[PDB]
């Protein structure tokens, strides 16, 4: 993946303002979760895979 947009990640970007979560290794501010830092893309798999400390699936 390119990195044409991480200049912002550099501590406080601009006059300290710009900031919009994004995913760890996918870059997708529009479908991520702060608390985890992982968009529903490169996280969907690992979910059911078995890499979330006691976080099963819901069904009822």
């Amino acid at each position: 993946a390119r990195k044409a947009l991480i200049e912002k990640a550099k501590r406080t970007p601009k006059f300290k303002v710009r900031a919009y979560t994004r995913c760890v290794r996918c870059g997708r501010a529009r479908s991520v979760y702060r608390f985890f830092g992982l968009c529903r893309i490169c996280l969907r798999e690992l979910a059911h895979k078995g890499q979330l400390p006691g976080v099963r699936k819901a069904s009822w």
């Binding site: 985890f36 895979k49 078995g50 400390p53």
Partner: protein, 206 residues
């Protein structure tokens, strides 16, 4: 897109999780994120070791971890060298005061996480192809292993589509909680096209 990962369900009920530990709060965004940061390396670090179970005991600021490996104490070195190096390697990244525990992996035949490795290895510098199929289905029954149902991904040495492999024996169901199976990731670095591994075979009942 149907059929999920059955072992998934059991992971919380009947299948001790991998990233199992107790921390909580803000950690999950930075600290936990770091887990993968470290993962990416350690994983590629000694993939040749022949791992098959990456156990993790992230005790309250005193993590442990106890991965299982193919080669017995061989990994530790010709007596015990990098073993220590490792306990100080991870410290550079995170010197969170973390114990280093390791174990072996007996009965590889019933250890998909280890057998799946063999696969990736057969795609590093060309190995068996057509016969390669059953070529990796005999050791199965060789030590019991009821069932021989395993999936691949596609292509056959360099086809055009993505066929799949057959086989279907032994009572290793999926629509019911009566299987118990183990499998480990196995990226397929291919010269002409990466693929996927799906080694899943019976392990036990109740």
């Amino acid at each position: 897109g149907n059929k999920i990962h059955p072992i998934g369900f059991r992971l919380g009920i009947t299948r001790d999780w991998e990233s199992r530990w107790y921390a909580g709060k803000k950690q999950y965004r930075h600290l936990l994120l770091e887990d993968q940061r470290i993962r990416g390396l350690l994983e590629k670090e000694l993939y040749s070791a022949g791992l098959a179970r990456v156990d993790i005991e992230r005790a309250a600021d005193n993590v442990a971890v106890t991965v299982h490996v193919a080669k017995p104490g061989v990994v530790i070195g010709r007596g015990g060298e990098r073993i220590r190096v490792l306990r100080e390697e991870l410290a550079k990244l995170t010197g969170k005061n973390v114990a280093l525990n390791v174990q072996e992996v007996q009965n590889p035949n019933l250890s998909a996480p280890l057998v799946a490795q063999r696969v990736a290895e057969q795609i590093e510098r060309r190995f068996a192809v057509r016969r390669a199929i059953k070529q990796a289905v005999q050791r199965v029954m060789e030590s019991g292993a009821k069932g021989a149902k395993v999936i691949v991904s596609g292509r056959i040495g360099g086809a055009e589509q993505a066929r799949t492999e057959w086989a279907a024996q032994g009572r290793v169901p999926l629509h019911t909680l009566r299987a118990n199976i183990d499998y480990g990731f196995a990226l397929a670095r291919t010269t002409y096209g990466v693929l996927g591994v799906k080694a899943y075979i019976f392990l036990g009942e109740v």
